[PDB]
């Protein structure tokens, strides 16, 4: 209800007033990083990781220990994505949508690595350090115990999302589709079928149990093949930092607490923006671009999360923006009627901006949907 600054300040007090004295020593090499950090952190106690990080970069000349701290958290946040560990996959090309690999069991100790990552993420939040692993917003929603919605499906699996749109808005009794309350699952060539409800192996989906079947299938997509691994991550995280400490945050604020912010050069953002049904001179967009100028970079980067799904830009700027099909630039269009709000589609980096009446209307209704919707 309150602002992000208050949520940040209150969370900093919890870590300050619950910190053990002295320091922990962690020594790593450039080439051993993942597996020195895995051994030493998983051999320490959860509460021990709460004492000052005294990182030893073997081979270097240790001076600035805050910078090696910022460095070690960033480099390790990218070393957990190594294909050799089979812990993570991507729902799209060019590293779009980072989600847990359901085939992580091919790593026999995988639950022990996920408990390790949970601790590593908790250490970053506890010590005010940032990561860049690239967890999706539904992943942060699970940490906040928020239930993933239908909108989140369009962010991680648009084709799965289009199937549920089609089911909801079509009388499937005319179109003639036998659907039951079941779902298959191929993990490592082993095909398994999950029952959505009690005895769903036998129950057709009709016009009546449809909206139910929709609440079920959505919840299955966010949990299938990842129940083990998610439990390991949260258990290791809760050991170091209690999960209740994040009760005030939302999924977009939690990403800010873990990834940080950049100043968003919109001389770049403006020139790398395409449109439907609009011109670069439509008084709508001439208003929109002037709104985003008066924004501070709090809400500027919140607009990025609302439209693109994350707060992190690619290294190439806004020209190398990637969607669920590959390179996809920032886009705005004429979608929605006058008494709507800005809705988005993160898989396309699209901002459905209805043609508003006045700048007063558009500065007012934009910031609300940016700050109160998803």
């Amino acid at each position: 209800d309150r602002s992000f600054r208050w949520k940040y300040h209150q969370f900093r007090f919890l870590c300050h007033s619950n910190a053990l004295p002295s320091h922990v020593k962690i020594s790593v090499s450039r080439q051993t990083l993942f597996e020195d950090s895995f051994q030493q952190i998983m051999n320490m106690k959860p509460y021990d990781l709460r004492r000052r990080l005294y990182i030893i970069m073997r081979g270097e000349e240790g001076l600035d220990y805050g910078g090696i701290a910022r460095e070690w958290f960033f480099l390790l946040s990218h070393e957990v994505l190594n294909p050799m560990y089979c812990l993570f996959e991507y729902a799209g090309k060019n590293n779009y949508c980072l989600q847990i690999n359901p085939a992580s069991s091919i790593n026999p100790d995988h639950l022990t690595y996920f408990r390790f990552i949970g601790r590593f993420i908790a250490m970053a939040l506890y010590h005010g350090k940032f990561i860049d692993t690239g967890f999706t917003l539904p992943f942060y929603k699970r940490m906040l115990n928020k239930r993933p919605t239908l909108k989140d499906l369009e962010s991680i699996d648009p084709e799965f999302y289009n199937s549920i749109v089609w089911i909801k808005e079509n009388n499937l009794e005319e179109c003639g589709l036998e659907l039951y309350f079941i779902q298959d699952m191929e993990i490592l060539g082993k095909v398994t079928t999950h029952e959505l409800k009690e005895g769903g192996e036998s129950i057709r989906v009709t016009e009546e149990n449809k909206e139910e079947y929709i609440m079920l299938l959505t919840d299955w997509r966010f949990t299938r093949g990842v129940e083990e691994q998610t439990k390991a991550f949260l258990d290791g995280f809760n050991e170091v930092a209690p999960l209740e400490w994040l009760r005030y945050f939302d999924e977009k604020e939690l990403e800010l607490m873990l990834c940080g912010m950049q100043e968003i050069d919109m001389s770049d953002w403006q020139k790398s923006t395409i449109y439907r049904h609009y011109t670069k001179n439509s008084k709508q967009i001439q208003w929109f671009w002037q709104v985003v100028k008066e924004m501070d970079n709090e809400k500027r980067i919140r607009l990025l999360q609302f439209v693109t799904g994350t707060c992190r830009l690619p290294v190439g700027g806004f020209a190398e923006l990637i969607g669920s099909n590959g390179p996809q630039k920032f886009c705005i269009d004429k979608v929605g009627k006058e008494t709507w709000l800005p809705r988005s589609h993160t898989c396309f980096n699209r901002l459905d901006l209805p043609p508003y009446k006045s700048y007063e209307q558009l500065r007012e209704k934009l910031l609300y949907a940016i700050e109160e919707t998803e």
Binding site: G67, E71, F130, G260, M261
Partner: peptide, 17 residues
């Protein structure tokens, strides 16, 4: 790659402050 994460600590700190 320090400029990557360093720019993110600076922008974040200037907002809070």
């Amino acid at each position: 790659d320090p400029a990557n994460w360093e720019c993110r600590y600076a922008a974040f700190n200037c907002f809070i402050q």
